[PDB]
Amino acid sequence: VPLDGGRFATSDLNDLYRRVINRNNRLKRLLDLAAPDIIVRNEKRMLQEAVDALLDNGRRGRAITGSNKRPLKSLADMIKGKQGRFRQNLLGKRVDYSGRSVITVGPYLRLHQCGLPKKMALELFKPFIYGKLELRGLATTIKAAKKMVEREEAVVWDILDEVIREHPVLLNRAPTLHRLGIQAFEPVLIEGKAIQLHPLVCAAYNADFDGDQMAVHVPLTLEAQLEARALMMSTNNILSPANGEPIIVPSQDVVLGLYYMTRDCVNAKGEGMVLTGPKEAERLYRSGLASLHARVKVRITEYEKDANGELVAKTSLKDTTVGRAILWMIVPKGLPYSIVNQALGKKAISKMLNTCYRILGLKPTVIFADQIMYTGFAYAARSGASVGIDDMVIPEKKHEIISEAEAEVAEIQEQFQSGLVTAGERYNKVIDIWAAANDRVSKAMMDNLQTE
Amino acid sequence: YSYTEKKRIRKDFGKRPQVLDVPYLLSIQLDSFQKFIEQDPEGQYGLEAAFRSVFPIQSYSGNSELQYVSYRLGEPVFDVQECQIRGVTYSAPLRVKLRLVIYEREAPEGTVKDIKEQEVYMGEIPLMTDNGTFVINGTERVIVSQLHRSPGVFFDSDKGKTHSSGKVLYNARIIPYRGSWLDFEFDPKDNLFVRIDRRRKLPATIILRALNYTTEQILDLFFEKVIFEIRDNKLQMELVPERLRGETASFDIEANGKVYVEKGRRITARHIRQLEKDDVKLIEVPVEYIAGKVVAKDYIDESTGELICAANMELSLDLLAKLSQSGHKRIETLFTNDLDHGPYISETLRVDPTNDRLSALVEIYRMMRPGEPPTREAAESLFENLFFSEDRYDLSAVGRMKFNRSLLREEIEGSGILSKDDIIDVMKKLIDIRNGKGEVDDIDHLGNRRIRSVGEMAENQFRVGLVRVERAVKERLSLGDLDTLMPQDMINAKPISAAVKEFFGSSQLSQFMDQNNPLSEITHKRRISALGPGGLTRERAGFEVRDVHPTHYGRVCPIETPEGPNIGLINSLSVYAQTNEYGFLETPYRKVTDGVVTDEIHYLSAIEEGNYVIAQANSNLDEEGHFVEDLVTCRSKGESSLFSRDQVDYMDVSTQQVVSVGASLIPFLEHDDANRALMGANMQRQAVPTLRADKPLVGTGMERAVAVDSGVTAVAKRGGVVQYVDASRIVIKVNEDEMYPGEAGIDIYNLTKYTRSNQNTCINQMPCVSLGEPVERGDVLADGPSTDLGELALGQNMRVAFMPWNGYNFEDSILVSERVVQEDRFTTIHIQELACVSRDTKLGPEEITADIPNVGEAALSKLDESGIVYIGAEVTGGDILVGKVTPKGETQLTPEEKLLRAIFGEKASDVKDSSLRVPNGVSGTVIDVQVFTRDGVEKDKRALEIEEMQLKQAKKDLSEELQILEAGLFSRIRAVLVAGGVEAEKLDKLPRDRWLELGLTDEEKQNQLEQLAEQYDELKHEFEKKLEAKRRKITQGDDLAPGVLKIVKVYLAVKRRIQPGDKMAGRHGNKGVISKINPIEDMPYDENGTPVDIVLNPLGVPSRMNIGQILETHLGMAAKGIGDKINAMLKQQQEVAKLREFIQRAYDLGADVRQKVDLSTFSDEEVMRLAENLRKGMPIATPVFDGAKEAEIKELLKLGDLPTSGQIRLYDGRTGEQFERPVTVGYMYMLKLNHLVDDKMHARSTGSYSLVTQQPLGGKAQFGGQRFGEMEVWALEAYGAAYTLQEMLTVKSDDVNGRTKMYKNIVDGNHQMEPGMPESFNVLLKEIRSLGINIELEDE
Amino acid sequence: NKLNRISRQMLQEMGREPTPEELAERMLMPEDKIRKVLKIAKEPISMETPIGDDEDSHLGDFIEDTTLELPLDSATTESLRAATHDVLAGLTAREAKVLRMR
Amino acid sequence: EIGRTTDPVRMYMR
Amino acid sequence: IETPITANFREGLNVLQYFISTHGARKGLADTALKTANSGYLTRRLVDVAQDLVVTEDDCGTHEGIMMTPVIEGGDVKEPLRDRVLGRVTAEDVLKPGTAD
DNA sequence: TCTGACGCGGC
DNA sequence: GCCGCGTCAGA
Ligand SMILES: [Mg+2]
């Protein structure tokens, strides 16, 4: 094929082939001349050489081309690929109808939705647009449909509405760790060029917002859509395929907010008020006439699936904080109080999620997980946790323990120089005194800080 | 203080006074390349040495030598600006006066015929800019420095693997600058084998055999003989007490009558002294002992003459009898005490069956060229030329000096070729280390690793050019008849300049300059690469060299390197560090004369550094450099701890010499983890300039130096007062101080306007100072891109609040206020270039006119009749810029189409559309358009008119240039001419141009008058050719590539505003994307009512160990609090005095500072002006380690009138409720990165495919599809999702019939599938079928 | 061969470089032919040449085959043929066959 | 001794 | 090193201490890089070797099975029997601490 | 580099 | 008979 500008491009095989034919024709001529044995053999040598270099160069003297510095690529090389077969395997199968750009958070979105940028979908879903434009008769033909897509008037949005409704879309990230590196979602159009990902599943993708990009594929047929929505949908795969434990587990804001809410205090606003129900508690808190963390007696009815998933109402007095009562409101009637009754950390939250799945089932845990996300965000925001210079507390006896450790290591180095101690003994002594001193500093800061 | 410092003081923290000023950072490159191009009559590095090394070119036995006198670099015919315009490589012609001198055949030496060449051209050499860069295609390139392992000898062990039993077997590799390699290796049985480089394994002794040494001669020169006397009969040895070194006794050793040493008892020092004082020479010994030794010389049987025992033959009892009967009184055995002197040369000599020189040369030749019958002269010439050929063997002056240093010789310079002393000394030191009487060397040592700059590489490839030129020239020197041919017929410059420009352009170290900020440029210029010829491989090396050596202290920065596959292979040079004499590394240090710390700096290499005890900077010095502790903290054996005072020879000049400029600029590095510091600095170098330069609140003092060395600032090279300021011309009137009596004039500084940088960004200079200010030589006239008040102003500092904002600050993403976009402080200008090319096919010449069949007149409206976009017109994505049409007829349409052409009147236009569309979604203004027609073809009207516009522009502007300086000249002629007897009535009304003939009183006046009159003559003929010259460049038809008739360049200027998804970071490595931009009202606010800007995640704090940013935030907020209070008193405008007082209290703030304050400068002008400038927050200088302590920050926080905990209670701007727990607010310095979501966004629906493979590709300019990798395949396999996978692998990519049919199905709204045969599978069939292997798809 | 010998000579006589015009000048040729040969002078550069930095696309891996008409226009032509046949139906028997055969 | 010298030049020369 | 970095980022470190830490930082990141490319390649090898294993039958009728224990590594029962056996098909009926229960 | 198969060569 | 060595080959 000719390159632009007058230039030509040719395979190395063509030049090798050409030389092959040339030498063969010369051999034909040489035969017609009745050439001596020595020269006929040399020509047969050259022929054998050329042929075998042509098939697979590399078992000979490495017969490159004229002046082009790189060794010529033989027939074998064209097939034999790294890694794996050239055309069938990596790299790498390019596919149409795909896009790639940066992911962005988007707190208000629900578990099964995603922000899908405007201009991408405009380009991608072109034929769906054209088809429905012409079938509904909003546009006379596909050519006029093309001019009308390229202007981008009100008409485009209705067709966009109809395709994006029943389309499910796939999000992909290059480190395909497991099958959940691609999940199916319902796309929701948003302004901008940034993809919105649901926060909870960021942990599964191991994604962070520092310029990472994700890929977005379009299942085109109805069957693909079905397979995506049924088998590949995010909401269907909450459980890790590896172990039974959760994959879509809390990331960070959630636990922090919950901690603010779940944490108990000696005394705050409205210590020792006795409430006949949770909603009054929450009403009191929202007015700032009560703190979220305060030990309190609340009248709450736990419900139990003792029957075939029915409600087994037990109705009396619980002693908890305000915060756990409010969260327990959100909590569906099938969870035992016991679960929220405790400290609630990452441990407890994950076990809670797990137990919720096993006893309650799929949908309560799904919806409740969404709930937990929003609540955690809310109370995290109201907590107002920050990081000041005084927040990193130098433990009271720091320099004492440091100077003691310093004087003792200096004493043990000088008594090393004295020659009652091998290298092993010295190593043991140094490492153990440092370990014990460091653990002392650790445990003293933890003691000092925890109950202050 | 300096003029810029008098203009703006910055508060500088710091207890120790920085004694040495920061050196010029680009000196290494500039000065070394300068050294390359240098008339200097000696064998010193550069062109000269290379020339004399290869010159004089002697005739191939024709008796016509070519002699070299001297060279001259012509002044480049094309200036910098024009070359940037046309995409030419900027170079200068080198022309050399050369002489061929011819002897007669066969004259005794006396050249009859001598011919002289009139400076033939040997090609053009690309020249370096003042900034240190290179124009190769009208683009600024940089040559990266290349580190490599220095020539000499290396003694490596590589144990364990060496026979898998330990077996510590060492080797010396001799690496030259120029020449074949030497290798000495061992064997399990201790024989030293030579490998010329990596061929078969021969004994090392064979080369010595070839070298004319006999076996016995070798045993002489290696082993020290032992004298064995025979007295009356039986075999006695003469033994010197010290010789017995480590030796169990085998006999009963009687001496002088008494048994001394018992047989077996280890000889003690007592026994040694016993024998010494007894004066024992000779001791009787049994012939059993001697029956176990070896015989050195070939001791003959004296009776007949017959040899019996040979050179290195085992001694046995009977042969001892044979020798004693023959009558040799003194027998020489060898000293080989296997612990010290082991079986090495003996066994090696035995294992080498070759004997004489000739057989050694034969086996040499048969190893080097195995199978061709050896001819003596061929083998000798081969072997000699391998190591003793002057042209072939150069170790380097460096290598030779280091070699002699390694072998402990005072004498520095050797003869390049391998002298045999060297060779033997090499094997001596190798077998020294093999016993263990030497150290093994480390590759990673700075003294063993040499740095190769520009000039040395240039010299290398130029030398290779000269060698091939010599082969060609001398070849033509021998055939042709000598007399008539002059020294130009033989020499073609083409392969020289071809190979040089191959090297210069097509190389890893020559790369496109990153032109975004000065930091990037400076680091690039001082970047050091481990690759290239004579250099390392990325896969080969290796944990070894990547790791951080102790020698780097105060010489290389450990923390500045790309975080890619490249880490360790970069290592940029530190601040105070320089290159030594031999291209090595040296560091300056302060003397300490035992108690007082002197001020003298001496550069020491690594070897010297190992010797002396150098103190750290962090030691307190009182009144004369006196340290407080008796036992002070220093390093002498390369390892730090406590030493006492009466020992310290030297001391660090300052702490800042350890780290490079970039790492040194990040504040409070001591409190930042190394990981995030490194990553921060790396990303920080890639930061892009915004619209508005301001200044970092917390600097280091270095920001002036950084700006100074940057070549984007304009610097005053004479000193004086600014005469005229324009946004195109900055004219300075020099003071009479620096005024040249001979040709002074005024100083004119032409500014740079929005031209495209390598990143397509804005590079514009704004003038800082005002008309009539007196300024000095080297003052900062106009600040460049993102540079202000003299200083680098990389980004902007914003109010951040640490709190969670309902999962909007989720992960590393950033929440930001609408007020940031509102002010337009983060909107970038990008100047993008597009080119429209009109080629000539044989289908017919393409045209640029507006005549374009069936296009909308919307696109035509913006085009002139010529078809060119209007200058300054604002367009949108898709819009047509430059019209182009191409020949296209004979459609050969299907029936129905012909039918419709008849019916509707569809008149077939024979020309296709080609006109230049704007890319998808990009919209900006045309700032300029360029048109390049090759000479010959008929220029279009608009091109002609715009080239006339540019013409007359250049004309007018240069005329203005000439006339301003001429007006200055003429004014000066009148001020001299009115002097000497004042006459201004008579003179004023005579004409001005009638003054060359004038004359007056004879002294300075008359001489200067004639000077300036001839300056007028010079300016007139100078300008008129300077014009003609420019009108030759514009007038000349522009030299285009073959096949292209004409070309039009169009510059688009896009103003790109910040949006959600762009990448932003701070200096500490914390980064993130803008997730949503919220109105100001939404954000929490203080009691005062000022609302916050950014909300940063507190959960981002604990694992990110960069805590210094919090200190910076507090000090930065209190700093703005200072600016607040001063602004308030400015708003009230009390009086100069009270603000000056307050500001002074600010400037001092306690004591222990190196500040040195005013009253120095102006009491009111500079003060109130500066005050106005400081309303925005006082710019401080925190040094990296000798910086502001937390307590001083607290003190200033009191002076800032803010809470000492730095937290304020915040009211939620949405709801109005206050938060529990108050939070830290304040300013931190943020940057918006070069990673713009606009570019990171890409999607493709349908487009161009690959020619051979039917998979999707990028040809639409709408980039190609995602790769469906094996990973993704596996993902699909994990689900049962078979139809999706099958579509994606085939129907979506490689199925030709299927995608078109399925497209139609999509338009029709049909959802089925038709996978067909994937073309890749057909590729497979065809590749197998191309072979002799039959693959048939069977059926059943 | 003449071209390149003169190329060698003209560069050494001029010093700077040899412009295409000056060589054509010195020869008795019609001048038009050097630029033609200059176009012809570009040697075959290999289609299999790997790209800059030797990536797993070679040079052939850029070049696209513009011959393939896009499925879009084939759909247009399909719609076109359907519309033509419906307007054919508006015509009489033999008038339709007239245009059908033509 | 022949060390796989594939070069037909050498053999022919011999 | 025997003497550690006694200071913290609140306090201030020096030249030497920072130098000590640079090694580990760079070494760590270089390990994470080149040994993760190693681990990826390893993984690819495991996936590729084990690909053919698919569920073809419901039940072949094997009586064979593996006697599973609680992994009692030293100090305690790090993973108990229930957890180890959770979700598994049994080979035969298990009896209580009493025969025929 | 590494882990290794199969000759290849040598002992 | 098993062990370095040398060739061949996947990343
Ligand atoms: Mg990330």
- Give the E-state strand segments of B679-821 in sequence order: 698-699, 720-725, 729-734, 747-750, 755-756, 762-763, 766-767, 774-775, 782-783, 787-788, 791-792, 796-802, 814-817
CA-to-CA dists, residue B282 to A412, B329, B330, B412, angstroms: 54, 13, 12, 44
**Residue by residue, what is the 3-state secondary structure of B589-635?**
EEEEECCEEEEEEEEECHHHHHHCCEECCCCCEECCCEECCCEEEEE
The closest of B571, B660, B144, B573 to E26, measured between CA atoms, is B571
Between CA B54 and CA B47 the distance in angstroms is 11
Q: Please, how many CA atoms are within 13 Å of residue B289, restricted to the half-sphere of its CB?
A: 17
Residue-by-residue DSSP string for A307-374: SSS----EEEEEEEEHHHHHHHHHS-TTS-HHHHTS---HHHHHHHHHHIIIII-HHHHHHHHHHHHH
Between CA E70 and CA A242 the distance in angstroms is 20
B772 CB neighbours strand F below 7 A = no
Place of tokens 């890893």: B508
Q: Is B173 helix (H, G, I), strand (E, B) or coil?
A: strand
Q: Residues B660, B560: contact at Cβ < 8 Å?
A: yes
CA-to-CA dists, residue C5 to B496, C2, C9, angstroms: 17, 5, 6
Q: Which nucleotides of F are covered by protein (CB under 7 A)?
A: 1
CATH code of the domain in which B961 resides: 6.10.140.1670
Residue B451 within any structural domain of the chain: yes
Which nucleotide is nearest to B541 if distance is taken from CA to C1'?
A: F1
- Annotate B434-446 with b (16+ C-beta within 10 A) or e (fewer): beeebeebbebbb
- Taken in order B226, B232, B235, B237, the sign of the CA dihedral is negative
Is there a cis peptide before residue A91, judged by omega within 30 degrees of 0?
Answer: yes
CATH code of the domain in which B166 resides: 3.90.1110.10
Which positions of A make up the binding site for Mg(2+)? Answer: 208, 210, 212
Which positions of A make up the binding site? Answer: 208, 210, 212
**Domain's final residue, options B1026, B1056, B1086:** B1056
Q: Please, how many CA atoms are within 13 Å of residue B1148, restricted to the half-sphere of its CB?
A: 10
Residue-by-residue DSSP string for B1249-1302: B-SSS-SB-S-SSSPPPPB--HHHHHHHHHTT-HHHHHIIIIITTT-HHHHHHH
Residues B1151 and B1211 in one domain: yes
Residue B1245 token pair: 């629906």
Q: Is B229 helix (H, G, I), strand (E, B) or coil?
A: strand
- 3-state helix, strand and coil shares in percent for chain A, rounded to the nearest 5: 50, 15, 35
Between CA B1208 and CA B1113 the distance in angstroms is 14
Identify the helix (H) or strand (E) that includes residue A295.
strand A295-302
Residue B806 within any structural domain of the chain: yes
Residue C86 token pair: 């419906």
Residues B646 and B670 in one domain: no
Q: Is A407 exposed, middle or buried (0-12, 13-18, 19+ CB in 10 A)?
A: exposed
CA-based Rg of chain D, rounded to a whole angstrom? 7
Q: Residues B293, B240: contact at Cβ < 8 Å?
A: no
In this structure, what are the phi and psi dihedrals at residue B493, rounded to the nearest 5 degrees?
A: -80, -15
Q: Residues B219, B334: contact at Cβ < 8 Å?
A: yes
Length of chain D: 14
Is there a cis peptide before residue A197, judged by omega within 30 degrees of 0?
Answer: no
Residue B986 within any structural domain of the chain: yes
Looking at the DSSP bridge assignments, the partners of residue B817 are B1078
Expressed as residue numbers, the domain containing B172 is 151-223+342-442
Which nucleotide is nearest to B161 if distance is taken from CA to C1'?
A: G4
Residue A203's closest chain B neighbor by CA?
A: B811
How do strand A195-196 and strand A182-190 relate by DSSP bridges? Answer: unpaired
Instruction: Give the distance, in angstroms, between residue B539 CA and nucleotide G7 C1'.
Output: 22
CATH code of the domain in which B599 resides: 2.30.150.10
In degrees, to the nearest 5, what angle opens at C-alpha D6 toward C-alphas D5 and D7? Answer: 95
Residue B1248 within any structural domain of the chain: no
Q: Residues B839, B895: contact at Cβ < 8 Å?
A: no
Instruction: Give the distance, in angstroms, between residue A71 CA and nucleotide G9 C1'.
Output: 18
Residue B1247 within any structural domain of the chain: no
Technique employed here was: cryo-EM
Q: Residues A57, A63: contact at Cβ < 8 Å?
A: yes
**Domain's final residue, options B786, B813, B837:** B786
Q: Is E37 helix (H, G, I), strand (E, B) or coil?
A: helix
Residues B817 and B694 in one domain: yes
CA-to-CA dists, residue E24 to B569, B673, B854, B1185, angstroms: 17, 11, 68, 22
Residues B933 and B1044 in one domain: yes
Between CA B804 and CA B1310 the distance in angstroms is 49
Residue B102 within any structural domain of the chain: yes
Residues B864 and B818 in one domain: no
CATH code of the domain in which B771 resides: 2.40.50.100
- Annotate C24-43 with b (16+ C-beta within 10 A) or e (fewer): beeeeeeeeebbeeeeeeee
Residues B160 and B61 in one domain: no
Between CA B804 and CA A385 the distance in angstroms is 7
Identify the helix (H) or strand (E) that includes residue C93.
helix C93-101
How do strand A113-117 and strand A182-190 relate by DSSP bridges? Answer: parallel
In this structure, what are the phi and psi dihedrals at residue B858, rounded to the nearest 5 degrees?
A: -55, -45
B1100 CA to centre of ligand 1 in angstroms: 13
Looking at the DSSP bridge assignments, the partners of residue B171 are B156
User: DSSP secondary-structure letter at A150?
Assistant: H
Between CA B779 and CA B721 the distance in angstroms is 11
Looking at the DSSP bridge assignments, the partners of residue B641 are B634
Length of chain A: 452
Which nucleotide is nearest to B163 if distance is taken from CA to C1'?
A: G4
Looking at the DSSP bridge assignments, the partners of residue A116 are A189
The separation between CA B404 and the C-alpha centre of its own chain, rounded to angstroms, equals 31
Residue A8's closest chain C neighbor by CA?
A: C44
User: End-to-end distance of chain B based on CA atoms, in angstroms?
Assistant: 96
Residue in A244, A394, A434 nearest the CB of E4: A434
In this structure, what are the phi and psi dihedrals at residue C21, rounded to the nearest 5 degrees?
A: -60, -50
CATH code of the domain in which B1233 resides: 2.40.270.10
Residues B834 and B913 in one domain: yes
Q: Is B224 helix (H, G, I), strand (E, B) or coil?
A: coil
Chain B residues 505-564, Cβ below 7 A from strand F = 539-542
Q: Is B1294 exposed, middle or buried (0-12, 13-18, 19+ CB in 10 A)?
A: buried
Between CA B950 and CA B958 the distance in angstroms is 12
CA-to-CA dists, residue E52 to A84, B1285, E48, E55, angstroms: 18, 18, 9, 10
Alpha helix positions (H), B670-723: 674-684, 703-709
Residue B16 within any structural domain of the chain: no
Residues B1008 and B914 in one domain: no
Between CA B107 and CA B128 the distance in angstroms is 48
Q: Residues B666, B672: contact at Cβ < 8 Å?
A: yes
Residues B1208 and B1083 in one domain: yes
- Taken in order A372, A376, A379, A381, the sign of the CA dihedral is negative
Residue-by-residue DSSP string for A223-257: HHHHHIIIIIBGGG--B-SSSSSBSS---SHHHHH
Instruction: Give the distance, in angstroms, between residue E44 CA and nucleotide F2 C1'.
Output: 17
Looking at beta carbons, which residues of chain C come within 8 Å of A65? 46
In this structure, what are the phi and psi dihedrals at residue B1338, rounded to the nearest 5 degrees?
A: -80, 180
Looking at the DSSP bridge assignments, the partners of residue B254 are B259
Resolution (A): 5.8
Residues B1013 and B1125 in one domain: no
What total of structural domains would you count in chain B?
9
Residue B1249 within any structural domain of the chain: no
Residues B463 and B604 in one domain: no
Between CA B552 and CA B569 the distance in angstroms is 14
The closest of B877, B954, B857, B866 to B918, measured between CA atoms, is B877
Identify the helix (H) or strand (E) that includes residue B152.
strand B152-156
CATH code of the domain in which B930 resides: 2.40.50.150
Question: Binding site annotation covers E37?
Answer: no
Alpha helix positions (H), B419-512: 420-435, 454-479, 494-505
B567 CA to centre of ligand 1 in angstroms: 21
Residues B53 and B197 in one domain: no
**Domain's final residue, options B304, B321, B341:** B341
Distance from the A61 Cα atom to the nearest Cα atom in chain B, whole angstroms: 15
Q: After which residue numbers is chain D interrupted with C–N beyond 2.5 angstroms?
A: none
Whether the CB of B370 is below 8 Å from some CB of chain D: the reply is yes
Distance from the A98 Cα atom to the nearest Cα atom in chain D, whole angstroms: 52
